[PDB]
Amino acid sequence: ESADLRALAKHLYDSYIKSFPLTKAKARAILTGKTDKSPFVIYDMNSLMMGEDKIKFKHIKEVAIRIFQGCQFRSVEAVQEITEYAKSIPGFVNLDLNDQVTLLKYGVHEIIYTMLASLMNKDGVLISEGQGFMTREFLKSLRKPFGDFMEPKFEFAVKFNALELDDSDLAIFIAVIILSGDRPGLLNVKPIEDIQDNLLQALELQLKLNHPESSQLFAKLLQKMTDLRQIVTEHVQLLQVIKKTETDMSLHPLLQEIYKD
Amino acid sequence: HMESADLRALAKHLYDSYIKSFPLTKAKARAILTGKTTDKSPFVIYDMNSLMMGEDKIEVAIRIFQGCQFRSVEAVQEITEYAKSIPGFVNLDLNDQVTLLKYGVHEIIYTMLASLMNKDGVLISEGQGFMTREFLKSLRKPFGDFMEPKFEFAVKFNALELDDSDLAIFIAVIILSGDRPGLLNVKPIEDIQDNLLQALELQLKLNHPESSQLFAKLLQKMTDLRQIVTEHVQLLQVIKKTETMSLHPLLQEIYK
Ligand SMILES: O=C(O)c1cccc(COc2cc(C(=O)O)ccc2-c2nn(C(=O)c3c(Cl)cccc3C(F)(F)F)c3ccc(Cl)cc23)c1
Numbered sequence: 001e002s003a004d005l006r007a008l009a010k011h012l013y014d015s016y017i018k019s020f021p022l023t024k025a026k027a028r029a030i031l032t033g034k035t036d037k038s039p040f041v042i043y044d045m046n047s048l049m050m051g052e053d054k055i056k057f058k059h060i061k062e063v064a065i066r067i068f069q070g071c072q073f074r075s076v077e078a079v080q081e082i083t084e085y086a087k088s089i090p091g092f093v094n095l096d097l098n099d100q101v102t103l104l105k106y107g108v109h110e111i112i113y114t115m116l117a118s119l120m121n122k123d124g125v126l127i128s129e130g131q132g133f134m135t136r137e138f139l140k141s142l143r144k145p146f147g148d149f150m151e152p153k154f155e156f157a158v159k160f161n162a163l164e165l166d167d168s169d170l171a172i173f174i175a176v177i178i179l180s181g182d183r184p185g186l187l188n189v190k191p192i193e194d195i196q197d198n199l200l201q202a203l204e205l206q207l208k209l210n211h212p213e214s215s216q217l218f219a220k221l222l223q224k225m226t227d228l229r230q231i232v233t234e235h236v237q238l239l240q241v242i243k244k245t246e247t248d249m250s251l252h253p254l255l256q257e258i259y260k261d
Numbered sequence: 262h263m264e265s266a267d268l269r270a271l272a273k274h275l276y277d278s279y280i281k282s283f284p285l286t287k288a289k290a291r292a293i294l295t296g297k298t299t300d301k302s303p304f305v306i307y308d309m310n311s312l313m314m315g316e317d318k319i320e321v322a323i324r325i326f327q328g329c330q331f332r333s334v335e336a337v338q339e340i341t342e343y344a345k346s347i348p349g350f351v352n353l354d355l356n357d358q359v360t361l362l363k364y365g366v367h368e369i370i371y372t373m374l375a376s377l378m379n380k381d382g383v384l385i386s387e388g389q390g391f392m393t394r395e396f397l398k399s400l401r402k403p404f405g406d407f408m409e410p411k412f413e414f415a416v417k418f419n420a421l422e423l424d425d426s427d428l429a430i431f432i433a434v435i436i437l438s439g440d441r442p443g444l445l446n447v448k449p450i451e452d453i454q455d456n457l458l459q460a461l462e463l464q465l466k467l468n469h470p471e472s473s474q475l476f477a478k479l480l481q482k483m484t485d486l487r488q489i490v491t492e493h494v495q496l497l498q499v500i501k502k503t504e505t506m507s508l509h510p511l512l513q514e515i516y517k
């Protein structure tokens with residue numbers, strides 16, 4: 001059966017590469033400097049202004065709001081990328097349609113956070129498919145509640161990146177998150193746990209072979225699902241406070257529908 | 262790291278201490294709950310009158326709260342004594358010992374409270390009593406809905422069918438979490454947990470060989486514990502702003 005898990009691992013790796021614009025391997029080359037050309041750096045107001053005329057941005061008057069909304073609309077794309085990737089997990093599309101929607105609804109936040117770490121180091125985050133790099137200093141120093149909305153993401157990423165996972169590890173881990181049988185309102189939990197039981201076996205085997213000197217990394221990576229749940233819940237508490245205080249965040253109602261999460 | 266026979270030695274050490282540290286084992290809890298026993302049989306409290314009769318045998322919502330609290334404090338004492346036997350714990354920096362306990366006792370109390378529960382109620386008074394979920398859930402003000410989440414967790418956790426020899430290692434793994442806030446030396450804590458995790462993995466493989474990926478499923482329960490402990494502390498705060506009950510100093514320090 002071991003070679004079936006390696007086949008599942010490779011299948012997920014291959015699909016992961018097709019689904020997401022910027023892999024972690026490629027992000028690491030950019031971030032470390034062992035890379036091709038150099039990304040545009042946003043480190044203060046003026047450099048943001050020039051970058052807009054340079055790289056494609058996910059936003060479209062105050063600066064902190066625009067950066068916030070850029071994070072949201074980039075998340076809207078990541079949802080579609082994750083949704084396409086989920087369809088390639090063996091067994092997923094045969095699940096009850098309402099269950100597929102439920103798993104995605106409750107999993108995209110944990111996966112976005114997870115994959116955002118691939119694009120971050122302690123000093124900043126890649127944006128616009130790696131062509132830009134926005135610094136932690138600038139993001140953290142944004143006004144009112146936006147500064148303190150950005151910084152928790154880096155604090156998570158820095159801890160998570162200490163596990164030193166590569167894309168072949170992450171392709172299976174992401175699948176494990178999606179196939180969580182404890183999401184509220186699932187109709188048929190059994191086939192979801194059956195699939196997740198397979199992915200877990202594959203994650204375990206992948207980690208033992210790809211990180212043979214990293215003891216109990218499997219266990220440590222599952223413990224990171226504690227950090228993911230925590231931060232997604234406080235994330236939601238943060239969005240509420242922003243929405244109940246900021247009515248200078250007026251968008252066209254159609255855009256508001258699009259990002260309603 | 263370890264040879265398999267050292268891990269089995271570690272499992273037995275922890276099971277043995279667990280038995281010495283905790284009054285009411287899960288095996289004894291299941292013997293009382295499932296029944297078929299004329300001697301181990303509990304008095305059942307399901308309403309006000311049976312609560313009045315239970316006092317002679319073995320405000321109402323507050324008195325039950327104080328019953329839960331006094332037992333939690335004893336639980337903290339028992340967990341602390343058990344922690345002292347986990348190899349390496351007492352050799353850790355003294356502030357880290359406090360830190361690990363401060364953040365681990367709530368997750369463990371919840372874990373071990375499940376052992377005393379079924380879907381219909383909870384053992385009390387070292388097993389001599391049994392208070393029903395229905396009665397607890399129906400308490401007034403904020404206390405009814407403070408009781409029910411414990412049952413909601415217990416039913417899910419007990420579906421794993423762990424016995425005490427599994428739980429002894431699981432409890433140790435929780436205590437030795439290197440990701441607790443404010444630890445000074447995470448590495449020695451992680452070396453110990455790597456050993457405890459290796460021991461848990463082997464214990465579950467041998468004691469539940471037909472239960473695939475139980476190790477992973479049990480670790481995913483440490484996620485549920487983090488959420489519920491947080492909701493617990495948030496509920497206690499709201500209750501404190503209406504009820505002037507008071508808390509034991511041991512619990513008082515832990516929640517600061
Ligand atoms: O294009 C621009 O203008 C832009 C400007 C700033 C940052 C980014 C890149 O941001 C991301 C890229 C990717 C990616 O490419 O894989 C994924 C996520 C983010 C990102 N989501 N997020 C959130 O709050 C968030 C999260 Cl974590 C999860 C779910 C939903 C959201 C929300 F919808 F609410 F946003 C961030 C907060 C801080 C930072 Cl620093 C980054 C993110 C792009």
Ligand SMILES: O=C(O)c1cccc(COc2cc(C(=O)O)ccc2-c2nn(C(=O)c3c(Cl)cccc3C(F)(F)F)c3ccc(Cl)cc23)c1
Pocket residue numbers: 324325326327328329330331332333336367370371373374377383384385386392397407408411497512
């Ligand atoms: O003596 C009576 O009258 C009595 C009547 C009902 C139940 C119990 C037994 O309860 C427990 C026994 C044991 C044990 O035996 O090891 C352990 C825990 C509880 C228990 N703690 N708790 C809490 O809110 C709590 C918790 Cl989880 C953790 C830390 C602090 C507290 C707090 F201090 F705030 F209470 C409960 C809530 C509901 C239920 Cl059902 C049980 C508990 C005794």
